[PDB]
């Protein structure tokens, strides 16, 4: 579950926090993919 997919529907604040963490990790991965030294 991540906030990048709009189809995600959080049931409670716990799932919302988990989604925030997953979104942060996914953005980290995407940044490293798009990074070119």
């Amino acid at each position: 579950a991540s906030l990048l997919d709009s189809n995600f529907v959080p049931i409670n604040f716990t799932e919302f926090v988990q989604a925030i963490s997953n979104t942060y990790k996914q953005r980290r991965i995407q940044f490293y993919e798009n990074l070119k030294r």
Partner: protein
């Protein structure tokens, strides 16, 4: 949830605009691993051996022989939870505070929840980046009045048992002297069998300005930056060398390898700012919200970081 919690909905709709932390550039993708823990500690056990005395010569009869000793070391990484509070306007009251081209009271500096959360998250990310870089938590340019952190909580700049060199106050303008100190530190570095890895250098703006001058009559083709890259390649086995400039540093140079076997960052999965469920509500139009974040989780091997400090006296 989003049909009941306007604040959660706003956080979900605003979290995209928050920029990525710049500390990611200082590490390789394989050097960062998440851990599921808010506050507490993690332990790692390493075994080692040592020679207690010279070897024993086996001749004729003898039963007193030198011994080889063993040791175990437990490295503990501490993770700490921290929180901030901020004030904002209430959603029901935002309409009475909307304006022609903005929402919020300029006179009292009251903001909508989304904007307030975004700005607070940006500030907290800046603080987290500063902590990761320097190993200290403070809001003063002097660097005093530091928050007391738990032991075994260090940054790249204050990690103990690393190579530290000091350029004298009278030689701060001499790039050749600075490079001499850097070369001494590079020689004293001990990468072991994991030497073949890309290297990362972080410099201050003044050092970056000094680096572009021609190498010393002065050379007409090569610069101090090129000389430094060649010197670091000599020790990393002609691997890639990346150079970065950070305004956070002040007259300090950091050199370290981008190898997960020597330096590893295991942050908590909740390290970055996260909203708290509790919201303070009164009969007025002002509400309060809380943001949580977790600090800690840098692990390094001994004698693998070069830290050069230029005295400004």
């Amino acid at each position: 949830l989003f049909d009941e919690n306007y604040y959660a909905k706003a956080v979900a709709n605003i979290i995209g605009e928050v920029k990525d932390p710049i500390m990611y550039k200082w590490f390789s993708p394989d050097q960062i691993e998440d851990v599921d823990l808010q506050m507490g500690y993690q332990k790692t056990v390493k075994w080692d051996a040592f020679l207690n005395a010279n070897p024993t010569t086996i001749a004729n009869e003898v039963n007193t022989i030198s011994t080889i000793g063993f040791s175990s070391e437990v490295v503990r990484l501490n993770y700490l939870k921290l929180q901030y509070k901020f004030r904002h306007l209430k959603q029901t009251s935002e309409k009475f505070y909307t304006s022609d081209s903005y929402i919020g009271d300029i006179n009292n500096n009251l903001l909508p929840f989304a904007q307030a959360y975004k700005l607070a998250s940006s500030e907290i990310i800046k603080l987290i980046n500063h902590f990761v870089l320097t190993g200290t938590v403070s809001i003063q340019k002097d660097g005093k009045n530091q928050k007391r952190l738990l032991p075994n909580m260090y940054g790249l700049l204050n990690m103990p048992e690393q190579i530290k060199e000091e350029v004298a106050s009278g030689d701060k303008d001499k790039m050749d002297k600075i490079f001499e100190k850097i070369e001494a530190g590079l020689s004293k570095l001990e990468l072991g069998d994991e030497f073949s890895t890309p290297m990362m250098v972080i410099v201050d703006p003044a050092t970056s300005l000094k680096l572009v001058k021609p190498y010393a009559a002065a050379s007409s083709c090569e610069k101090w930056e090129d000389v430094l890259i060649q010197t670091i390649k000599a020790i990393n086995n002609r691997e890639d060398v990346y150079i970065e400039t950070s305004n956070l540093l002040k007259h300090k140079i950091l050199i370290y390898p981008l190898n997960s076997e020597l330096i590893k960052f295991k942050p908590s999965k909740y390290m970055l700012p996260t909203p708290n469920e509790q919201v303070d509500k009164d009969s007025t139009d002002v509400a309060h919200s809380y943001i949580d974040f977790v600090l800690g989780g840098l692990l390094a091997t001994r004698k693998t970081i070069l830290q050069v400090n230029i005295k400004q006296s």
